[PDB]
Amino acid sequence: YSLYGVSGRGVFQNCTAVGVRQQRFVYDAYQNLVGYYSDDGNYYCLRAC
Amino acid sequence: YSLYGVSGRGVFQNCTAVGVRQQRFVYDAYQNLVGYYSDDGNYYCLRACVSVPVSVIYDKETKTHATLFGSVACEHISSTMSQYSRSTRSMLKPVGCVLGLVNSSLFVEDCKLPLGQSLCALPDTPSTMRLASIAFNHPIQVDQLNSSYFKLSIPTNFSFGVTQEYIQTTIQK
Amino acid sequence: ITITYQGLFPYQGDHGDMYVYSAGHATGTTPQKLFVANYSQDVKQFANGFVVRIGAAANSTGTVIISPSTSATIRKIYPAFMLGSSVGNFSDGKMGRFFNHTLVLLPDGCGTLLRAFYCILEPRSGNHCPAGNSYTSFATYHTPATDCSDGNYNRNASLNSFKEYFNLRNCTFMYTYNITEDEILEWFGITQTAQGVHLFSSRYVDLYGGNMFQFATLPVYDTIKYYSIIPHSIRSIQSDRKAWAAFYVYKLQPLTFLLDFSVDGYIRRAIDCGFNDLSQLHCSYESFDVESGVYSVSSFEAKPSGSVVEQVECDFSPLLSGTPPQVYNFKRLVFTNCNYNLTKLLSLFSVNDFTCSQISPAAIASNCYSSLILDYFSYPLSMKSDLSV
Amino acid sequence: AQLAKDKVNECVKAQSKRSGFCGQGTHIVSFVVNAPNGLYFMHVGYYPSNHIEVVSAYGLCDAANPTNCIAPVNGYFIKTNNTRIVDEWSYTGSSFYAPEPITSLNTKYVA
Amino acid sequence: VTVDCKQYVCNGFQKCEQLLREYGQFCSKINQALHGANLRQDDSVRNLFASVKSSQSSPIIPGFGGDFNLTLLEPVARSAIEDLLFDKVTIADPGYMQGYDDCMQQICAQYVAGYKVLPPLMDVNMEAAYTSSLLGSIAGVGWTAGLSSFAAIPFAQSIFYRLNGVGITQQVLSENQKLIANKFNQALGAMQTGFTTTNEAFQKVQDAVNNNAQALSKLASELSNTFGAISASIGDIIQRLDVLEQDAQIDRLINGRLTTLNAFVAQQLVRSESAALSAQLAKDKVNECVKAQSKRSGFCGQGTHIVSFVVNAPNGLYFMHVGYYPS
């Protein structure tokens, strides 16, 4: 993928359902994003390489 | 204080009598100055800053914190002390004096059990707050007889069994 | 996820500043004088901004304020703010005047919109206006009998009242934000960065829980240093008087909090780590829960008092001994590297005049210098008009 | 791990007549199960808990002086001279509870 | 010793405190790591003494063995030989509501703060109570015939059976004669006189007190004053420039000073783990050499071992193994 200001390499899946949903990432306690948003409008949660 | 080219924070006292006395500091083997000069003309020997080495006695089971000071003082502190900088930091929140000063009642209150959470020198501090137990030791002391006979403490019940310790053997590789 | 996070927060237990708006004076039929607190003269430092608890008492029973013996059901009311970069006094000397471009946050339409605008505020000169006679305070108002009738709320009522006290000039923007009418508790926040002024609300993203999220960035790039609360008074008639929920302003500062995020992403618990050692310990472990034990929190260092400075004593000697020469033979005392008690010296003499140039007599006693020159001579008071810079 | 090998060869195979290591009490059995990354022991020790203070000697003698005491635990109580020792109490006339060392002081019983 | 970081670094100055904020993870891992180290050490103390006493003293009467003059009696509370190896060891510490104020009348575990020494879980009268009931159980437990379900036998007969055991001289020699007693007491007498300086163990004791006192105070004196590039305890404190570059030199001083503090924490984990190894060794020396005899060589040092005594030394135990020496 290559999203807005963020790079990265991930395996998107239609996951559920944890986030903010108004701004459009979700991190897990580090710099990484685990990982949905951005698609319109679902939950494409990402993973590491 | 703020002396000539040197800054610092100290408690001056009229001490005696070690120095050079012609140039006007005295160091002790480091960068620090311990510390008289400059006054005209005496010995105002300085010291490092005063710090109250505080702590916290949580107890998450009953959710009752209890702020303990390190080793000073039952007499020198004040409640929500206004001479000092950092609680820490914005807001704070007096019984000793076996170890130091604590902001937690009460006086001993002996003796139990002993167990955690097991504060310092010997306040064993159960909860519920309600500090300072001294629960030691105590072995069932057989008494020593005098003549050819000598007492001995044999028991009556087996009561086996415990689980015991892990011995670690490896790492994850 | 839970975490420790460093950002702008109010501190645990902060009571903040409370503000209340009141029904105005009225007869049975006719609204009369507005009724307000002294908020307009109380200019506050913006610093890092603030958050606001709005409507908390809504639903409960409370006093009507202007008639303390009269109780009524409390309704939410929205706060209004004046913010800017430069303040001073109005022509009659009263405080609370904002100069140059000023940011105004003004609710309207019986609590169904927020207006945000950035204009020069020209004080108007009619009676009771800020550049007129009989000025006490500016304020805003609305008139519920005519402004809040079903299906026909007056959007501009508050704006119009504001325009009576000030002409709006050279406005760079005027934005409106719709608000759905309810009596639900909410939070509002405001900060500023080089990107402009940021407005936060719980309304759009967490109406029922209170977390604040950004809903606007205003193109205000002049640093906001000051704010005041704009008093509102409700021009009801006596039989229509309501009680309006107090709101509370809490200053923000950079603090590290433990933040507990639910599964759905919202924050329903936090710990102010610096509140005390117990909270400190609680934060360590990167968890809400900290296992039961002794946890060392730092000092408590004493406050500096009696700041000793050492450098001595300036020698005014030869002035006191002998005959002061004539003005054209003035004697010169030079001063490098010493301490001076000059109010000492001027306590010996009787002093008849003290004027300075590019300094004041107050200032010349206080300051430190790299060089002080004292010239003294005999000179008659009769010739004071000739001894002038 | 070399300690664990020392705990398997001592406490698990044999008994091991030694204190903790074989934790807290006169050790009886010990069991080994694999824990995460390590072993894990279930040392089955004795725990006395009801102590009754009785009286020794130290042994016995008569007109002729060969002695008794001890195989291996003490005494020789009184009522009359009985010998269940560590842990419970008390046996019969001894008959196999007695080596026969040299006499000592406090003559005839035999301290 | 626990360091109170976020006020060790820095000295308590708000800009430097904010630059610590930036590093608010590392300080939490420091004090988390030391509090874990103290719970492991404290469980070594607790588990040690719970594997010390358990059963059953004589109790402490001024006559232990007739006539073995034992110095290990409590005079009354920290017995006499324990008084010798606490007086001759040079400790500038501790303060417990008299030493803080006593130093205030004038080591600095309570003045930099900074670092801070915690008390050792047990008052000295109570560690003295453990080892004094241990001296009570020397005689009867040294019999055995099982550990521990016994006994009350006088100390003299305990050393004639302990001496009958491995110095396998049977009863006719200890009957004719004793005095041995004066040779035992002569041995303990030279054990009274000789501590300084050529008698390590004792130099090992001051290697320990000078070890942890050296690490604590002297390493904390290297950590502060001075380390960094410009390091007058705040980089460009108030008195010198810049304000912009002040964060640069200060962040040098925080990265360095906190990194060396983290080296101190790694060191405390090292000497804590080795202290727990040696404490488990001490539990192996109390359960073998002190209760029983122990029919084994050094560990129970140099000769067919006879008695061994335990006294609390600074930070550790201390043994007075009474061995045989043929000659």
Coordinates of all heavy atoms in Angstrom, one line a residue, chain E residues 50-111, unseen atoms left out:
Chain E
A50 N 13.5 -17.6 56.2 CA 12.5 -18.6 56.4 C 13.1 -20.0 56.2 O 12.5 -21.0 56.7 CB 11.3 -18.4 55.4
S51 N 14.1 -20.1 55.4 CA 14.9 -21.3 55.4 C 16.1 -21.2 56.5 O 16.9 -22.1 56.4 CB 15.5 -21.6 54.1 OG 16.3 -20.5 53.6
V52 N 16.1 -20.2 57.3 CA 17.0 -20.3 58.5 C 16.3 -20.9 59.7 O 16.7 -21.9 60.2 CB 17.6 -18.9 58.8 CG1 18.2 -18.9 60.1 CG2 18.6 -18.5 57.8
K53 N 15.2 -20.3 60.2 CA 14.9 -20.5 61.6 C 14.1 -21.8 61.8 O 14.6 -22.8 62.2 CB 14.3 -19.3 62.2 CG 13.0 -18.6 61.7 CD 11.8 -18.9 62.5 CE 10.5 -18.4 62.0 NZ 9.4 -18.7 62.9
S54 N 12.8 -21.8 61.4 CA 11.8 -22.8 61.4 C 11.5 -23.6 62.7 O 10.4 -23.9 63.0 CB 12.1 -23.8 60.3 OG 13.3 -24.6 60.6
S55 N 12.5 -23.7 63.6 CA 12.6 -24.6 64.7 C 14.0 -24.6 65.3 O 14.9 -24.3 64.6 CB 12.2 -26.0 64.3 OG 10.8 -26.2 64.1
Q56 N 14.2 -25.0 66.6 CA 13.5 -24.7 67.8 C 14.7 -24.3 68.7 O 15.6 -25.1 68.9 CB 12.8 -25.8 68.4 CG 11.7 -26.4 67.7 CD 10.8 -27.3 68.5 OE1 11.0 -27.4 69.7 NE2 10.0 -28.1 67.8
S57 N 14.6 -23.2 69.4 CA 15.8 -22.7 70.1 C 16.0 -23.4 71.5 O 15.2 -24.3 71.9 CB 15.8 -21.2 70.3 OG 17.0 -20.8 71.0
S58 N 17.0 -23.0 72.2 CA 17.4 -23.7 73.5 C 16.6 -23.1 74.7 O 16.3 -23.9 75.6 CB 18.9 -23.7 73.7 OG 19.2 -24.3 74.9
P59 N 16.4 -21.8 74.9 CA 16.8 -20.5 74.3 C 18.1 -20.0 74.7 O 18.9 -20.7 75.4 CB 15.7 -19.6 74.7 CG 15.3 -20.1 76.0 CD 15.4 -21.6 75.9
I60 N 18.4 -18.7 74.4 CA 19.6 -18.1 74.7 C 19.7 -17.8 76.2 O 19.1 -16.9 76.7 CB 19.8 -16.7 73.9 CG1 19.7 -17.0 72.4 CG2 21.0 -16.0 74.2 CD1 20.8 -17.9 72.0
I61 N 20.6 -18.6 76.9 CA 20.8 -18.5 78.3 C 22.3 -18.1 78.3 O 23.1 -18.6 77.4 CB 20.5 -19.8 79.0 CG1 19.0 -20.0 79.0 CG2 21.0 -19.8 80.5 CD1 18.5 -21.3 79.5
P62 N 22.8 -17.3 79.3 CA 24.3 -17.0 79.3 C 25.2 -18.2 79.4 O 26.4 -18.0 79.1 CB 24.4 -16.1 80.5 CG 23.1 -15.4 80.6 CD 22.0 -16.4 80.1
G63 N 24.7 -19.3 79.9 CA 25.6 -20.5 79.8 C 25.2 -21.4 78.6 O 24.1 -22.1 78.7
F64 N 25.9 -21.4 77.5 CA 25.7 -22.4 76.5 C 26.3 -23.7 76.7 O 25.6 -24.7 77.0 CB 26.2 -21.8 75.1 CG 25.4 -20.7 74.6 CD1 25.9 -19.4 74.8 CD2 24.2 -20.9 73.9 CE1 25.2 -18.3 74.3 CE2 23.5 -19.8 73.5 CZ 24.0 -18.5 73.6
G65 N 27.6 -23.7 76.7 CA 28.4 -25.0 76.9 C 29.4 -24.9 78.0 O 30.1 -23.9 78.2
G66 N 29.5 -25.9 78.8 CA 30.3 -26.0 79.9 C 31.6 -26.8 79.7 O 31.4 -28.1 79.7
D67 N 32.7 -26.2 79.6 CA 32.9 -24.8 79.6 C 33.4 -24.3 78.2 O 34.6 -24.3 78.0 CB 33.8 -24.3 80.7 CG 33.2 -24.4 82.1 OD1 31.9 -24.2 82.1 OD2 33.9 -24.6 83.1
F68 N 32.6 -24.0 77.3 CA 33.0 -23.4 76.1 C 32.6 -21.9 76.1 O 31.4 -21.6 76.0 CB 32.3 -24.1 74.9 CG 32.7 -25.6 74.7 CD1 31.8 -26.4 74.0 CD2 33.8 -26.1 75.3 CE1 32.1 -27.7 73.9 CE2 34.0 -27.5 75.2 CZ 33.2 -28.3 74.5
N69 N 33.5 -21.0 76.3 CA 33.2 -19.6 76.3 C 32.8 -19.2 75.0 O 33.6 -19.0 74.1 CB 34.5 -18.8 76.8 CG 34.1 -17.4 77.4 OD1 35.0 -16.8 78.0 ND2 32.9 -17.0 77.2
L70 N 31.5 -19.0 74.8 CA 30.9 -18.5 73.5 C 30.7 -17.0 73.6 O 30.0 -16.5 74.4 CB 29.6 -19.3 73.2 CG 30.0 -20.7 72.8 CD1 28.7 -21.5 72.5 CD2 30.8 -20.6 71.5
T71 N 31.4 -16.3 72.7 CA 31.2 -14.9 72.4 C 29.9 -14.6 71.7 O 29.5 -13.5 71.7 CB 32.4 -14.4 71.6 OG1 33.6 -15.1 72.1 CG2 32.6 -13.0 71.8
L72 N 29.3 -15.6 71.1 CA 28.2 -15.4 70.2 C 26.9 -15.2 71.0 O 25.8 -14.9 70.4 CB 28.0 -16.7 69.3 CG 29.1 -16.9 68.2 CD1 29.2 -15.7 67.4 CD2 30.4 -17.4 68.7
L73 N 26.9 -15.2 72.3 CA 25.8 -14.8 73.2 C 25.4 -13.4 72.9 O 26.2 -12.5 72.6 CB 26.3 -14.8 74.6 CG 25.5 -14.4 75.9 CD1 24.1 -14.9 75.9 CD2 26.3 -14.9 77.1
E74 N 24.1 -13.1 73.0 CA 23.7 -11.7 72.9 C 23.8 -11.0 74.3 O 23.3 -11.6 75.3 CB 22.3 -11.6 72.5 CG 22.1 -11.9 71.0 CD 20.7 -11.7 70.6 OE1 19.8 -11.6 71.4 OE2 20.4 -11.8 69.4
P75 N 24.5 -9.9 74.4 CA 24.6 -9.3 75.8 C 23.3 -8.7 76.3 O 23.0 -8.8 77.5 CB 25.7 -8.2 75.6 CG 25.7 -7.9 74.1 CD 25.3 -9.2 73.4
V76 N 22.5 -8.0 75.4 CA 21.3 -7.3 75.8 C 21.5 -6.3 76.9 O 21.3 -5.1 76.7 CB 20.2 -8.3 76.1 CG1 18.9 -7.5 76.5 CG2 19.8 -9.1 74.9
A77 N 19.6 -8.9 69.8 CA 20.2 -7.6 69.9 C 21.7 -7.6 69.6 O 22.5 -7.1 70.4 CB 20.0 -6.9 71.3
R78 N 22.1 -8.2 68.5 CA 23.4 -8.0 67.8 C 24.6 -8.4 68.7 O 25.1 -7.6 69.4 CB 23.5 -6.6 67.3 CG 24.8 -6.4 66.5 CD 25.0 -5.0 66.0 NE 24.4 -4.6 64.8 CZ 24.5 -3.5 64.2 NH1 25.2 -2.5 64.7 NH2 23.8 -3.2 63.1
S79 N 24.9 -9.7 68.8 CA 25.9 -10.3 69.6 C 27.3 -9.7 69.5 O 27.6 -8.9 68.6 CB 26.0 -11.8 69.4 OG 27.1 -12.3 70.1
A80 N 28.2 -10.2 70.3 CA 29.5 -9.6 70.5 C 30.4 -9.7 69.3 O 31.1 -8.7 68.9 CB 30.2 -10.2 71.7
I81 N 30.5 -10.9 68.7 CA 31.3 -11.1 67.5 C 30.7 -10.3 66.4 O 31.4 -9.6 65.6 CB 31.6 -12.5 67.2 CG1 32.6 -13.1 68.1 CG2 32.0 -12.7 65.8 CD1 32.9 -14.6 67.9
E82 N 29.4 -10.3 66.3 CA 28.7 -9.5 65.4 C 28.9 -8.0 65.6 O 29.0 -7.2 64.7 CB 27.2 -9.8 65.4 CG 26.3 -9.1 64.5 CD 24.9 -9.6 64.6 OE1 24.6 -10.5 65.4 OE2 24.0 -9.0 63.9
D83 N 29.1 -7.6 66.9 CA 29.5 -6.2 67.2 C 30.9 -6.0 66.7 O 31.2 -4.8 66.3 CB 29.4 -5.9 68.7 CG 28.0 -5.4 69.0 OD1 27.4 -4.8 68.2 OD2 27.5 -5.7 70.2
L84 N 31.8 -6.9 66.7 CA 33.2 -6.7 66.3 C 33.2 -6.5 64.7 O 33.8 -5.6 64.2 CB 34.1 -7.9 66.7 CG 34.4 -7.9 68.1 CD1 35.3 -9.1 68.4 CD2 35.1 -6.7 68.6
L85 N 32.5 -7.4 64.0 CA 32.5 -7.2 62.6 C 31.4 -6.3 62.1 O 31.2 -6.2 60.9 CB 32.3 -8.6 61.9 CG 31.1 -9.5 62.3 CD1 30.0 -9.3 61.3 CD2 31.5 -10.9 62.3
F86 N 30.8 -5.5 63.0 CA 30.1 -4.3 62.6 C 30.8 -3.1 63.0 O 30.6 -2.0 62.3 CB 28.7 -4.2 63.1 CG 27.7 -4.9 62.2 CD1 27.0 -6.0 62.6 CD2 27.3 -4.3 61.1 CE1 26.0 -6.6 61.9 CE2 26.3 -4.8 60.3 CZ 25.7 -6.0 60.7
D87 N 31.7 -3.1 64.0 CA 32.4 -1.9 64.4 C 33.6 -1.8 63.5 O 34.0 -0.7 63.0 CB 32.8 -2.0 65.8 CG 31.7 -1.8 66.8 OD1 30.6 -1.2 66.3 OD2 31.8 -2.2 67.9
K88 N 34.3 -2.9 63.1 CA 35.6 -2.8 62.4 C 35.3 -2.5 60.9 O 36.2 -2.0 60.2 CB 36.4 -4.1 62.6 CG 36.8 -4.2 64.0 CD 37.7 -5.5 64.2 CE 38.1 -5.6 65.7 NZ 38.9 -6.8 65.9
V89 N 34.2 -2.9 60.4 CA 33.8 -2.6 59.0 C 33.4 -1.1 59.0 O 32.7 -0.6 59.8 CB 32.6 -3.5 58.6 CG1 32.2 -3.1 57.2 CG2 33.1 -4.9 58.6
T90 N 33.9 -0.4 58.0 CA 33.7 1.1 57.8 C 32.5 1.3 56.9 O 32.6 1.3 55.7 CB 35.0 1.7 57.3 OG1 35.2 1.2 56.0 CG2 36.1 1.3 58.2
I91 N 31.4 1.7 57.6 CA 30.2 2.1 56.9 C 29.9 3.6 57.3 O 29.9 3.9 58.5 CB 29.0 1.2 57.2 CG1 29.2 -0.2 57.0 CG2 27.8 1.6 56.3 CD1 29.5 -1.0 58.3
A92 N 29.8 4.4 56.3 CA 29.4 5.8 56.6 C 27.9 6.0 56.7 O 27.5 7.0 57.4 CB 30.0 6.8 55.5
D93 N 27.2 5.1 56.2 CA 25.7 5.0 56.3 C 25.3 4.4 57.6 O 26.2 4.1 58.4 CB 25.2 4.1 55.1 CG 25.2 4.9 53.8 OD1 24.8 6.1 53.8 OD2 25.4 4.3 52.7
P94 N 24.0 4.2 58.0 CA 22.7 4.6 57.5 C 22.0 5.6 58.3 O 22.4 6.0 59.4 CB 22.0 3.2 57.5 CG 22.5 2.7 58.8 CD 23.9 3.1 58.9
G95 N 20.9 6.1 57.7 CA 20.0 7.0 58.4 C 18.6 6.6 58.5 O 17.9 6.5 57.4
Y96 N 18.0 6.4 59.7 CA 16.6 6.1 59.9 C 16.1 6.9 61.0 O 16.1 6.6 62.2 CB 16.5 4.6 60.2 CG 17.2 3.7 59.3 CD1 18.3 2.9 59.8 CD2 16.9 3.5 58.0 CE1 18.9 2.0 58.9 CE2 17.5 2.7 57.1 CZ 18.6 1.9 57.6 OH 19.2 1.1 56.8
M97 N 15.6 8.1 60.6 CA 15.1 9.2 61.5 C 16.1 9.7 62.5 O 15.7 10.5 63.5 CB 13.8 8.8 62.2 CG 12.6 8.9 61.3 SD 12.4 10.6 60.8 CE 12.2 11.4 62.4
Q98 N 17.4 9.4 62.4 CA 18.4 10.1 63.2 C 19.6 10.4 62.3 O 20.4 11.4 62.6 CB 18.9 9.2 64.4 CG 17.9 9.1 65.5 CD 18.5 8.4 66.7 OE1 19.6 7.8 66.7 NE2 17.7 8.3 67.8
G99 N 19.8 9.7 61.2 CA 21.0 9.9 60.4 C 20.7 10.9 59.2 O 21.7 11.6 58.8
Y100 N 19.5 11.1 58.8 CA 19.1 12.2 57.9 C 19.3 13.5 58.6 O 20.0 14.4 58.1 CB 17.7 12.1 57.5 CG 17.2 13.1 56.6 CD1 17.3 13.0 55.2 CD2 16.5 14.3 57.0 CE1 16.9 14.0 54.3 CE2 16.1 15.2 56.2 CZ 16.3 15.1 54.8 OH 15.8 16.0 54.0
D101 N 18.7 13.7 59.8 CA 18.9 14.9 60.6 C 20.3 15.0 61.0 O 20.8 16.1 61.1 CB 17.9 14.9 61.7 CG 16.5 14.7 61.3 OD1 16.1 15.2 60.2 OD2 15.7 14.1 62.0
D102 N 21.0 13.9 61.3 CA 22.3 13.9 61.8 C 23.3 14.4 60.7 O 24.3 15.0 61.0 CB 22.7 12.6 62.4
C103 N 23.0 14.0 59.5 CA 23.8 14.6 58.4 C 23.4 16.0 58.0 O 24.1 16.7 57.4 CB 23.7 13.6 57.2 SG 24.5 12.0 57.4
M104 N 22.1 16.3 58.4 CA 21.7 17.7 58.1 C 22.3 18.7 59.1 O 22.5 19.9 58.8 CB 20.1 17.7 58.3 CG 19.5 19.0 58.0 SD 19.9 19.6 56.4 CE 19.4 21.3 56.6
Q105 N 22.8 18.1 60.3 CA 23.5 19.0 61.2 C 24.9 19.3 60.7 O 25.5 20.2 61.3 CB 23.6 18.2 62.6 CG 22.2 18.1 63.3 CD 22.3 17.1 64.5 OE1 23.4 16.5 64.7 NE2 21.2 16.9 65.2
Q106 N 25.4 18.6 59.8 CA 26.7 18.8 59.2 C 26.8 20.1 58.4 O 27.5 20.1 57.4 CB 27.2 17.6 58.4 CG 27.3 16.3 59.2 CD 27.8 15.2 58.3 OE1 28.0 15.3 57.1 NE2 28.0 14.0 58.9
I107 N 25.9 7.8 51.5 CA 26.0 8.9 52.4 C 24.9 9.9 52.1 O 24.0 10.1 52.9 CB 27.4 9.6 52.4 CG1 28.5 8.6 52.7 CG2 27.4 10.8 53.4 CD1 29.9 9.2 52.6
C108 N 25.0 10.5 50.9 CA 24.0 11.4 50.4 C 23.0 10.7 49.5 O 22.6 11.1 48.4 CB 24.6 12.5 49.6 SG 25.6 13.6 50.7
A109 N 22.4 9.6 50.1 CA 21.3 8.9 49.5 C 20.0 9.7 49.8 O 19.0 9.3 49.2 CB 21.1 7.5 50.2
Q110 N 20.1 10.7 50.6 CA 18.9 11.4 51.1 C 19.1 12.9 50.9 O 18.5 13.7 51.5 CB 18.7 11.1 52.6 CG 18.4 9.6 52.8 CD 18.4 9.3 54.3 OE1 18.7 10.1 55.1 NE2 18.1 8.0 54.6
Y111 N 20.0 13.3 50.0 CA 20.3 14.7 49.8 C 20.5 15.0 48.3 O 20.1 16.1 47.9 CB 21.6 15.1 50.5 CG 21.5 15.1 52.0 CD1 22.1 14.1 52.8 CD2 20.8 16.1 52.6 CE1 21.9 14.2 54.2 CE2 20.6 16.2 54.0 CZ 21.2 15.2 54.8 OH 21.1 15.3 56.1

